[PDB]
């Protein structure tokens, strides 16, 4: 290690900071000490009798948690799908070609409480299950994560998909309408239900019960916003995953990308457990969280913003990262992308243009590099005393100056404060 001494009297000082471990947990590590996904659902104590329990519990608030699990179970466990191709994930194969399979093929276990203190039951209940009633319960995980003025925007269509079947019925109230759904996300069995449903119909899309994915689709990749940022950055720049990574100019971002891309996580696999790594309890610390990739979040999102992103505006500004360096890297990358458009003929009728030999000339090279090669741009930047030019400053100023209604502690709020003054 490095030795530090004080100059005035030649004494040794050892700079110390409080330990900060807290490492990320990969989906593949779960399958080296376990081979099943435990789903503790209490034995179905009378099928039709449960439909009255939750019908009133959601009607006038305070519903039983374990009763919701069993009702969804005893209704969805009869949906069967014909396995076209073989299926495997992380070691355990859940079937093969020709076989029939159900939603709850993940390993079901039985809870030991039975019935929670008598929840208010209801007598008047006909065949409303399998139609619209179980679909409504799954879609309350979606509303249980949004607290902004968008909860009366997603629950809007929630009382439209249930009307497709038979009747138009609304359960939760106005004041304490959202104070009962955020509890559900804490119950690990409920998260395992909505994830298994979404995973099932992702395989069997042509089945008519796929419509259930209305309130289950938000689960797919819930804790993978860092991978979303990567995807978004590739689309907005138009360049490939490999070429984008070669534009990483900061060490902390490099660390995070290496962490994000660790081999053998089934990241690009079709039909896998990985997308639902928290909901299936495969991980308690997502390696694909934005919070665990703060530098890459900031850098990736700022660059996207400067390239006219609609999403990056209101993205969180992370704490405890080297803002000034990530800004320069982001400015240079965006300036490089922004200066050099694609621009090439795609179709022709008689004649077409080419220029694969003619690059410059010419000595009119008082201008930035031609393409998007990071090497040429780093060389060109080195010629500017590693300092952003009036041109880049202006470019970034144009990119932000129009922005309006920016929130505290967002990348939008940051960028404007930085480039427009």
């Amino acid at each position: 290690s490095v030795t530090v001494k004080r100059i005035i009297d030649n004494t040794v000082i050892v700079p110390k900071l409080p330990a900060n471990e807290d490492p990320v947990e990969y989906p593949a590590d779960y399958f080296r000490k376990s081979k099943e996904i435990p789903l503790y659902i209490n034995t179905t104590k009378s099928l039709s009798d449960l439909r009255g329990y939750v019908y009133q519990g959601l009607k006038s608030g305070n519903v039983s948690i374990i009763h919701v699990n069993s009702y969804l179970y005893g209704a969805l466990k009869d949906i069967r799908g014909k396995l076209d191709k073989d299926w495997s994930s992380f070691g355990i194969n859940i079937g093969k070609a020709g076989d029939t399979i159900g939603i709850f093929d993940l390993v079901s276990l039985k809870a030991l409480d039975g019935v929670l203190p008598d929840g208010v039951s209801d007598a008047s209940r006909t065949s409303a299950d399998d139609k619209w009633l179980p679909l409504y319960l799954l879609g309350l995980y979606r509303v249980g994560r949004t607290q902004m003025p968008e909860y009366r925007k997603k629950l809007m269509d929630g009382l439209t998909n249930q009307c497709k079947m038979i009747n138009e019925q609304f359960e939760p109230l106005v004041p304490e309408g959202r104070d009962i759904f955020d509890v559900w996300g804490n119950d690990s069995n409920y998260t395992k239900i909505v994830a298994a449903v979404d995973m099932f119909f992702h395989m069997f899309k042509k089945h008519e019960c796929a419509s259930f994915r209305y309130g289950t689709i938000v689960s797919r990749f819930k804790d993978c916003a860092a991978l979303a940022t990567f995807g978004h950055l590739c689309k907005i720049t138009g360049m490939s995953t490999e070429d984008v990574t070669t534009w990483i100019l900061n060490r902390e971002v490099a660390d995070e990308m290496v962490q994000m891309m660790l081999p053998g996580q089934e990241i690009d696999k079709a039909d896998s457990y990985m997308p639902y790594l928290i909901d299936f309890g495969l991980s308690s610390k997502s390696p694909y969280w934005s919070v665990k990739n703060p530098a890459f979040h900031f850098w990736g999102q700022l660059t996207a913003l400067l390239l006219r992103s609609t999403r990056a505006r209101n993205a969180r500004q992370p704490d405890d990262i080297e803002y000034t360096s990530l800004t320069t890297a982001g400015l240079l990358y965006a300036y490089a992308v922004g200066s050099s458009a694609d621009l090439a003929q795609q179709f022709c009728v008689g004649d077409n243009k080419y220029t694969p030999d003619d690059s410059t000339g010419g000595l009119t090279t008082n201008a930035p590099p031609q393409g998007r090669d990071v090497v040429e741009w780093l060389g060109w930047f080195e010629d500017q005393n590693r300092k952003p030019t009036p041109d880049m400053m202006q470019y970034a100023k144009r990119a932000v100056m129009s922005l309006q209604g920016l929130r505290e502690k967002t990348i939008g709020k940051y960028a404007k404060s930085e480039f427009d003054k």
Binding site: D357, T360, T365, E376, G379, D383
Partner: protein, 73 residues
């Protein structure tokens, strides 16, 4: 022309490109210097090699490192 290195201000150098399909960079001494006010300010002395006066003379156009990886400069 003064001084001792300003005599080679008319003849040009040819640098071989590093990329498979690219035009070779042709450069002369007076293309990177105005007269004497620019030549004395940067670091141009009387005693200089023709290559060293070109290489270290790459400042007026602001392209030393960019021409270093694009061409065999």
């Amino acid at each position: 022309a003064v001084s001792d290195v300003w005599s080679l201000s008319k003849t040009s150098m040819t640098f071989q490109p590093k990329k498979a399909s690219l035009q070779p960079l042709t450069i002369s001494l007076d293309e990177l210097f105005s007269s004497r006010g620019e030549f004395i300010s940067v670091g141009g002395n009387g005693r200089m090699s023709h290559k060293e006066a070109i290489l270290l003379g790459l400042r007026y156009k602001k392209l030393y490192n960019q021409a270093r990886v694009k061409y065999s400069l």
